[PDB]
Short mmCIF file of C-alpha atoms in Angstrom, two decimals:
data_model
loop_
_atom_site.label_atom_id
_atom_site.label_comp_id
_atom_site.label_asym_id
_atom_site.label_seq_id
_atom_site.Cartn_x
_atom_site.Cartn_y
_atom_site.Cartn_z
CA UNK A 1 0.03 -0.19 0.09
CA UNK A 2 1.48 3.02 -1.16
CA UNK A 3 0.72 6.37 1.62
CA UNK A 4 1.08 9.18 0.18
CA UNK A 5 1.16 12.51 2.88
CA UNK A 6 -0.98 15.30 2.19
CA UNK A 7 0.12 18.67 1.61
CA UNK A 8 -1.68 21.50 3.40
CA UNK A 9 -2.75 25.14 2.65
CA UNK A 10 -4.29 27.31 4.64
CA UNK A 11 -5.64 30.69 2.98
CA UNK A 12 -8.22 33.17 2.49
CA UNK A 13 -10.31 33.00 -0.81
CA UNK A 14 -9.89 37.45 -1.04
CA UNK A 15 -7.62 39.70 0.16
CA UNK A 16 -8.13 39.96 4.11
CA UNK A 17 -9.16 42.77 6.04
CA UNK A 18 -9.87 42.84 9.49
CA UNK A 19 -13.88 43.20 10.15
CA UNK A 20 -14.64 42.25 6.52
CA UNK A 21 -16.42 39.09 5.30
CA UNK A 22 -14.51 36.44 3.32
CA UNK A 23 -13.91 32.67 2.84
CA UNK A 24 -11.29 30.30 4.67
CA UNK A 25 -9.87 27.63 2.55
CA UNK A 26 -8.17 24.72 3.64
CA UNK A 27 -6.49 22.97 0.09
CA UNK A 28 -5.14 19.54 0.99
CA UNK A 29 -3.40 17.57 -1.77
CA UNK A 30 -0.90 14.55 -2.74
CA UNK A 31 -2.54 12.24 -0.83
CA UNK A 32 -2.91 8.62 -0.94
CA UNK A 33 -5.38 6.88 0.35
CA UNK A 34 -8.64 9.14 -0.27
CA UNK A 35 -9.76 9.10 3.21
CA UNK A 36 -9.24 12.02 5.00
CA UNK A 37 -10.90 13.99 8.16
CA UNK A 38 -10.39 17.88 7.41
CA UNK A 39 -11.33 20.70 9.83
CA UNK A 40 -11.06 24.51 10.04
CA UNK A 41 -10.49 25.94 13.02
CA UNK A 42 -11.08 28.99 15.19
CA UNK A 43 -9.14 29.82 18.47
CA UNK A 44 -8.40 25.97 18.45
CA UNK A 45 -12.21 25.18 18.16
CA UNK A 46 -13.98 22.91 15.11
CA UNK A 47 -16.12 25.25 12.83
CA UNK A 48 -18.81 23.91 12.12
CA UNK A 49 -20.50 25.09 8.54
CA UNK A 50 -17.52 23.39 6.73
CA UNK A 51 -17.86 22.35 2.78
CA UNK A 52 -15.39 20.85 0.80
CA UNK A 53 -15.04 20.17 -3.12
CA UNK A 54 -15.80 16.84 -4.73
CA UNK A 55 -12.97 13.95 -4.66
CA UNK A 56 -10.55 14.56 -7.80
CA UNK A 57 -6.84 13.90 -8.49
CA UNK A 58 -4.01 14.84 -10.59
CA UNK A 59 -2.14 12.87 -13.34
CA UNK A 60 0.29 10.99 -10.33
CA UNK A 61 -3.19 9.48 -8.71
CA UNK A 62 -2.90 11.88 -5.65
CA UNK A 63 -6.05 13.24 -4.63
CA UNK A 64 -6.85 16.87 -3.77
CA UNK A 65 -9.74 18.41 -1.84
CA UNK A 66 -10.79 22.05 -1.16
CA UNK A 67 -12.63 22.54 2.09
CA UNK A 68 -13.94 26.24 2.86
CA UNK A 69 -15.91 28.23 5.17
CA UNK A 70 -17.42 31.87 5.34
CA UNK A 71 -15.62 33.74 7.65
CA UNK A 72 -14.31 37.65 9.20
CA UNK A 73 -10.74 38.22 9.92
CA UNK A 74 -9.93 40.11 12.97
CA UNK A 75 -6.54 40.87 15.02
CA UNK A 76 -7.40 38.72 17.75
CA UNK A 77 -9.20 35.78 16.21
CA UNK A 78 -6.69 32.71 15.39
CA UNK A 79 -7.64 30.01 12.47
CA UNK A 80 -6.44 26.98 11.42
CA UNK A 81 -6.85 23.66 9.70
CA UNK A 82 -5.99 20.07 11.28
CA UNK A 83 -5.78 17.36 8.94
CA UNK A 84 -5.43 13.97 9.61
CA UNK A 85 -4.47 10.77 7.17
CA UNK A 86 -3.45 7.29 7.66
CA UNK A 87 0.09 8.62 6.97
CA UNK A 88 -0.14 11.00 10.11
CA UNK A 89 1.19 9.51 13.41
CA UNK A 90 -0.46 12.79 14.82
CA UNK A 91 -3.16 15.55 13.36
CA UNK A 92 -1.12 18.49 11.56
CA UNK A 93 -1.89 21.67 12.25
CA UNK A 94 -1.40 24.75 10.02
CA UNK A 95 -2.15 28.03 10.94
CA UNK A 96 -3.44 30.64 8.76
CA UNK A 97 -1.04 33.46 7.58
CA UNK A 98 -2.51 35.88 6.06
CA UNK A 99 0.67 37.17 4.24
CA UNK A 100 0.60 33.25 2.77
CA UNK B 1 -6.52 28.62 -27.08
CA UNK B 2 -6.33 24.71 -26.67
CA UNK B 3 -9.40 22.89 -24.50
CA UNK B 4 -9.68 19.52 -22.75
CA UNK B 5 -12.77 17.69 -21.21
CA UNK B 6 -11.69 15.12 -18.83
CA UNK B 7 -13.78 12.90 -16.48
CA UNK B 8 -12.23 11.35 -13.45
CA UNK B 9 -13.63 8.49 -11.59
CA UNK B 10 -12.91 6.81 -7.73
CA UNK B 11 -14.00 3.57 -6.24
CA UNK B 12 -12.99 3.18 -2.75
CA UNK B 13 -14.03 -0.62 -1.63
CA UNK B 14 -15.97 -1.17 1.78
CA UNK B 15 -15.02 -4.16 3.36
CA UNK B 16 -17.50 -5.30 6.10
CA UNK B 17 -20.55 -3.85 4.86
CA UNK B 18 -21.79 -2.68 1.30
CA UNK B 19 -20.61 -1.45 -2.16
CA UNK B 20 -17.72 0.70 -3.07
CA UNK B 21 -17.88 4.77 -2.60
CA UNK B 22 -18.05 5.72 -5.64
CA UNK B 23 -17.52 9.49 -7.10
CA UNK B 24 -17.43 10.88 -10.77
CA UNK B 25 -16.38 14.18 -11.62
CA UNK B 26 -16.14 16.35 -15.23
CA UNK B 27 -14.41 19.18 -16.20
CA UNK B 28 -13.62 21.20 -19.05
CA UNK B 29 -10.32 22.66 -18.86
CA UNK B 30 -10.31 23.98 -14.92
CA UNK B 31 -13.66 24.14 -14.65
CA UNK B 32 -15.63 20.99 -13.05
CA UNK B 33 -19.54 21.07 -14.71
CA UNK B 34 -20.95 17.45 -13.22
CA UNK B 35 -20.52 15.23 -10.42
CA UNK B 36 -22.29 11.40 -9.35
CA UNK B 37 -21.48 10.67 -5.64
CA UNK B 38 -23.44 7.74 -4.29
CA UNK B 39 -23.53 8.57 -0.54
CA UNK B 40 -25.81 11.48 -1.84
CA UNK B 41 -29.17 11.42 -1.81
CA UNK B 42 -30.35 12.02 -5.81
CA UNK B 43 -28.45 9.34 -7.12
CA UNK B 44 -28.29 11.10 -10.38
CA UNK B 45 -25.43 13.29 -12.37
CA UNK B 46 -25.87 16.21 -11.24
CA UNK B 47 -24.89 19.55 -12.97
CA UNK B 48 -21.65 21.83 -11.32
CA UNK B 49 -21.63 24.54 -13.31
CA UNK B 50 -24.83 26.92 -14.96
CA UNK B 51 -24.07 26.28 -18.66
CA UNK B 52 -24.75 22.51 -18.47
CA UNK B 53 -28.09 23.45 -16.94
CA UNK B 54 -28.97 23.87 -20.25
CA UNK B 55 -29.28 19.86 -21.00
CA UNK B 56 -32.81 18.49 -20.81
CA UNK B 57 -34.16 15.54 -19.21
CA UNK B 58 -32.56 13.05 -21.49
CA UNK B 59 -29.30 14.34 -21.49
CA UNK B 60 -29.42 13.80 -17.20
CA UNK B 61 -31.20 10.75 -17.73
CA UNK B 62 -28.39 9.29 -20.02
CA UNK B 63 -25.61 10.52 -17.95
CA UNK B 64 -26.88 8.69 -15.02
CA UNK B 65 -27.66 5.39 -16.50
CA UNK B 66 -23.96 5.32 -18.10
CA UNK B 67 -22.41 6.74 -14.75
CA UNK B 68 -24.21 4.42 -12.42
CA UNK B 69 -23.09 1.46 -15.15
CA UNK B 70 -19.18 2.89 -14.45
CA UNK B 71 -20.01 2.15 -10.72
CA UNK B 72 -20.71 -1.35 -10.89
CA UNK B 73 -17.58 -2.02 -13.51
CA UNK B 74 -15.35 -0.36 -11.21
CA UNK B 75 -17.26 -2.60 -8.19
CA UNK B 76 -16.39 -5.33 -10.40
CA UNK B 77 -12.83 -4.34 -11.16
CA UNK B 78 -12.51 -4.26 -7.62
CA UNK B 79 -13.07 -7.37 -6.77
CA UNK B 80 -10.92 -9.14 -9.89
CA UNK B 81 -8.10 -7.25 -8.77
CA UNK B 82 -8.13 -8.59 -5.09
CA UNK B 83 -7.96 -11.71 -6.89
CA UNK B 84 -5.33 -11.06 -9.33
CA UNK B 85 -2.84 -9.64 -6.55
CA UNK B 86 -3.98 -12.21 -4.05
CA UNK B 87 -5.05 -10.06 -1.11
CA UNK B 88 -7.50 -10.46 1.02
CA UNK B 89 -11.27 -9.53 1.60
CA UNK B 90 -10.42 -7.38 4.99
CA UNK B 91 -8.69 -4.36 3.14
CA UNK B 92 -9.82 -1.37 1.26
CA UNK B 93 -8.72 -0.50 -1.78
CA UNK B 94 -9.22 2.15 -4.58
CA UNK B 95 -9.67 2.21 -8.35
CA UNK B 96 -9.04 5.38 -10.44
CA UNK B 97 -10.15 5.59 -14.06
CA UNK B 98 -9.50 9.04 -16.17
CA UNK B 99 -10.01 10.20 -19.58
CA UNK B 100 -10.62 12.43 -21.85
CA UNK B 101 -9.45 14.58 -24.97
CA UNK B 102 -7.88 17.86 -26.17
CA UNK B 103 -8.50 19.98 -29.16
CA UNK B 104 -5.90 22.58 -30.20
CA UNK B 105 -6.76 26.23 -31.16
CA UNK B 106 -8.92 24.88 -34.08
CA UNK B 107 -10.77 23.06 -31.64
CA UNK B 108 -10.45 19.79 -33.41
CA UNK B 109 -8.99 16.65 -31.84
CA UNK B 110 -5.11 16.70 -30.74
CA UNK B 111 -5.26 14.22 -28.10
CA UNK B 112 -7.06 11.12 -26.36
CA UNK B 113 -6.13 9.60 -22.86
CA UNK B 114 -7.73 6.72 -21.11
CA UNK B 115 -5.30 5.59 -17.68
CA UNK B 116 -6.34 3.10 -15.14
CA UNK B 117 -4.77 2.76 -11.30
CA UNK B 118 -5.12 0.23 -8.71
CA UNK B 119 -4.04 1.02 -4.97
CA UNK B 120 -2.60 4.70 -6.58
CA UNK B 121 -0.13 2.80 -9.09
CA UNK B 122 -0.33 2.70 -12.38
CA UNK B 123 -2.28 -0.11 -14.00
CA UNK B 124 -3.30 -0.14 -17.35
CA UNK B 125 -3.31 2.99 -19.80
CA UNK B 126 -3.89 3.77 -23.75
CA UNK B 127 -0.92 4.61 -25.83
CA UNK B 128 -1.01 8.03 -27.33
CA UNK B 129 -2.02 6.34 -30.66
CA UNK B 130 -5.10 5.36 -28.99
CA UNK B 131 -4.10 1.86 -30.72
CA UNK B 132 -2.42 -0.11 -27.97
CA UNK B 133 -1.81 -0.49 -24.57
CA UNK B 134 0.56 0.09 -21.55
CA UNK B 135 0.19 -2.59 -18.82
CA UNK B 136 2.37 -1.88 -15.71
CA UNK B 137 2.45 -5.71 -14.47
CA UNK B 138 1.52 -9.38 -14.93
CA UNK B 139 -1.91 -8.63 -13.89
CA UNK B 140 -2.29 -5.67 -16.18
CA UNK B 141 -0.72 -7.76 -18.83
CA UNK B 142 -3.62 -10.02 -18.59
CA UNK B 143 -6.49 -7.09 -18.88
CA UNK B 144 -4.29 -6.13 -21.58
CA UNK B 145 -4.49 -9.39 -23.56
CA UNK B 146 -8.22 -9.40 -22.53
CA UNK B 147 -9.01 -6.34 -24.19
CA UNK B 148 -7.01 -6.79 -27.11
CA UNK B 149 -9.34 -10.05 -28.05
CA UNK B 150 -12.46 -7.92 -27.34
CA UNK B 151 -11.11 -4.71 -29.43
CA UNK B 152 -11.61 -2.56 -26.07
CA UNK B 153 -9.07 0.73 -28.00
CA UNK B 154 -11.10 0.69 -31.00
CA UNK B 155 -14.41 1.55 -29.36
CA UNK B 156 -12.30 4.10 -27.22
CA UNK B 157 -10.65 5.47 -29.91
CA UNK B 158 -14.23 6.12 -31.53
CA UNK B 159 -15.31 7.84 -28.43
CA UNK B 160 -12.37 9.91 -27.70
CA UNK B 161 -11.68 11.44 -31.47
CA UNK B 162 -15.57 11.29 -31.59
CA UNK B 163 -18.34 11.83 -29.35
CA UNK B 164 -15.41 13.58 -26.39
CA UNK B 165 -14.63 16.33 -29.15
CA UNK B 166 -18.08 16.82 -30.43
CA UNK B 167 -19.54 17.68 -26.72
CA UNK B 168 -16.71 19.54 -25.39
CA UNK B 169 -16.99 21.83 -28.82
CA UNK B 170 -20.89 22.06 -27.55
CA UNK B 171 -19.99 23.18 -23.96
CA UNK B 172 -17.41 25.37 -24.86
CA UNK B 173 -19.99 27.13 -27.00
CA UNK B 174 -22.80 27.12 -24.79
CA UNK B 175 -20.59 28.15 -21.79
CA UNK B 176 -18.61 30.51 -23.82
CA UNK B 177 -19.33 33.54 -21.33
CA UNK B 178 -16.61 31.62 -18.55
CA UNK B 179 -15.06 28.93 -20.62
CA UNK B 180 -13.72 30.97 -23.65
CA UNK B 181 -12.60 33.85 -21.07
CA UNK B 182 -9.23 34.39 -19.77
CA UNK B 183 -8.92 36.26 -16.21
CA UNK B 184 -5.46 37.47 -16.20
CA UNK B 185 -4.05 37.60 -12.69
CA UNK B 186 -4.13 40.03 -10.44
CA UNK B 187 -0.29 41.00 -9.29
CA UNK B 188 1.02 42.43 -6.43
CA UNK B 189 4.34 42.42 -3.94
CA UNK B 190 4.67 42.43 -0.08
CA UNK B 191 7.75 43.28 1.90
CA UNK B 192 8.77 41.61 5.05
CA UNK B 193 11.87 42.13 7.41
CA UNK B 194 12.86 39.03 8.66
CA UNK B 195 15.74 41.50 10.70
CA UNK B 196 17.42 44.41 10.10
CA UNK B 197 19.55 42.25 7.32
CA UNK B 198 17.25 40.45 5.76
CA UNK B 199 13.94 40.90 3.83
CA UNK B 200 11.32 38.53 2.34
CA UNK B 201 9.12 40.09 -1.10
CA UNK B 202 6.49 37.76 -2.40
CA UNK B 203 5.36 38.34 -5.56
CA UNK B 204 1.22 37.60 -5.53
CA UNK B 205 -1.00 36.25 -8.51
CA UNK B 206 -4.62 36.14 -7.68
CA UNK B 207 -7.83 35.66 -9.06
CA UNK B 208 -6.65 33.88 -12.64
CA UNK B 209 -7.79 31.18 -15.15
CA UNK B 210 -6.73 28.90 -16.29
CA UNK B 211 -4.76 27.59 -13.63
CA UNK B 212 -1.38 27.36 -15.77
CA UNK B 213 0.97 30.06 -15.12
CA UNK B 214 4.66 30.95 -14.11
CA UNK B 215 5.94 33.27 -11.46
CA UNK B 216 9.91 33.90 -11.42
CA UNK B 217 12.36 36.09 -9.80
CA UNK B 218 15.49 38.13 -11.51
CA UNK B 219 17.90 39.97 -9.98
CA UNK B 220 19.86 42.23 -12.14
CA UNK B 221 18.22 40.95 -15.11
CA UNK B 222 19.23 37.08 -14.51
CA UNK B 223 17.00 34.34 -13.13
CA UNK B 224 16.86 33.75 -9.35
CA UNK B 225 15.99 30.38 -8.03
CA UNK B 226 18.28 30.58 -5.06
CA UNK B 227 16.62 31.54 -1.75
CA UNK B 228 13.11 31.17 -3.13
CA UNK B 229 10.27 29.31 -2.50
CA UNK B 230 7.06 28.93 -5.29
CA UNK B 231 3.89 27.80 -3.53
CA UNK B 232 1.61 25.04 -5.38
CA UNK B 233 -1.19 26.94 -7.59
CA UNK B 234 -4.43 26.71 -5.47
CA UNK B 235 -8.17 26.93 -5.86
CA UNK B 236 -9.60 30.28 -4.73
CA UNK B 237 -13.30 28.85 -4.75
CA UNK B 238 -14.80 31.20 -6.69
CA UNK B 239 -13.74 29.28 -10.04
CA UNK B 240 -10.32 31.17 -10.40
CA UNK B 241 -6.77 30.25 -8.86
CA UNK B 242 -4.18 31.61 -6.33
CA UNK B 243 0.03 31.75 -6.35
CA UNK B 244 2.91 33.41 -5.24
CA UNK B 245 6.77 33.19 -5.09
CA UNK B 246 8.68 34.80 -2.34
CA UNK B 247 12.36 35.99 -2.36
CA UNK B 248 14.71 36.44 0.48
CA UNK B 249 17.22 39.37 -0.24
CA UNK B 250 19.74 41.54 1.84
CA UNK B 251 17.27 44.52 3.41
CA UNK B 252 18.23 47.78 1.20
CA UNK B 253 18.60 45.34 -2.35
CA UNK B 254 15.24 45.38 -2.80
CA UNK B 255 15.64 47.17 -5.76
CA UNK B 256 17.39 44.69 -7.88
CA UNK B 257 14.43 41.80 -7.72
CA UNK B 258 11.85 41.64 -10.34
CA UNK B 259 8.98 38.98 -10.27
CA UNK B 260 7.96 37.80 -14.02
CA UNK B 261 4.42 36.62 -14.69
CA UNK B 262 3.25 34.76 -17.75
CA UNK B 263 -0.26 33.90 -17.96
CA UNK B 264 -2.48 32.89 -21.09
CA UNK B 265 -4.40 36.38 -20.15
CA UNK B 266 -1.66 38.62 -20.52
CA UNK B 267 -0.56 39.72 -24.11
CA UNK B 268 2.78 39.79 -22.75
CA UNK B 269 4.51 38.59 -19.56
CA UNK B 270 4.19 41.32 -16.88
CA UNK B 271 7.16 42.73 -14.91
CA UNK B 272 6.58 43.64 -11.24
CA UNK B 273 8.90 45.90 -8.95
CA UNK B 274 9.21 46.88 -5.14
CA UNK B 275 8.40 50.07 -4.19
CA UNK C 1 -20.85 13.53 -22.47
CA UNK C 2 -19.44 10.47 -20.81
CA UNK C 3 -18.25 7.28 -22.42
CA UNK C 4 -21.62 4.70 -22.98
CA UNK C 5 -19.88 1.57 -23.19
CA UNK C 6 -17.78 -0.17 -20.40
CA UNK C 7 -15.36 -3.58 -19.84
CA UNK C 8 -14.54 -4.86 -16.53
CA UNK C 9 -10.30 -5.81 -16.09
#
């Protein structure tokens, strides 16, 4: 069984401005098998209204998914994406950095 | 420019109870336009772009029929492959198939594709001429012989050169407002001082379509790859794409560094500088 | 338009 670990990017759909409505994305790619656990976090707490793209894959057969929810950034609030996959001994957390 | 239609199918066996999870998606270029998900309530092929909703009941009944048949083929395949590879009934396994056609600027057939993988590894694929097969191992070789005897390649070629391009052309016209539109990247540069000696310049491309793009750095007019980082192109979630490239520079020398942007939606390459 | 004929491996 091949085990390819997911690559993770966490970022906004639109330019991020404190106080202004936006969408938070977590893009997971390059992984195999397809089963994966992705949550978006607000100050460490799981966000409930999270949707995701339909499962697809690249030429090398590795899967990719976009998970997304509506959010309003602020100076204080911390956002992150938490990923678990068979390849990961522990869940990987990637912080949202507005410059990234 | 050139265009493509591709379909992607993933089946994942569920040992212990019931049929595989089956997910099918269809794209024109970088735009998804249909899906089927065995776990969804409708058990229909469903629209995922506005321009496919123009298609009538007969379209949707046909696509549903075929895609359900597809899920059954993969279900059978999963059992066969387990036997080929002498695997237990216990584990979960995956079959993936992708096929489609490319047309050039004349919207005429350029290339066709039909490939298959088992557990994320190449299994069998049609060769570029659409007349023979590449089989990765002896299991796939047995499939190759079976498909040769059944003249599968001939019928696949007929679809890829015929129906595939004919319907791609149809979709391109019906979806012209978005499918034939190029969205040039919206570009800007940011600056961050890591210390009083070293700074990061980040060159952004946002809101572009299609996804294909090149972002590069030059220093004094020569390509610079050292001390650079380039993220994978990523979906914005509104149909467009995002990318950035960064370079680490000596603080105060930002002016030497220029970002270069190439994209279908730009008549000529773009050059950006820090200010 | 998806391909309307199928074969098993």
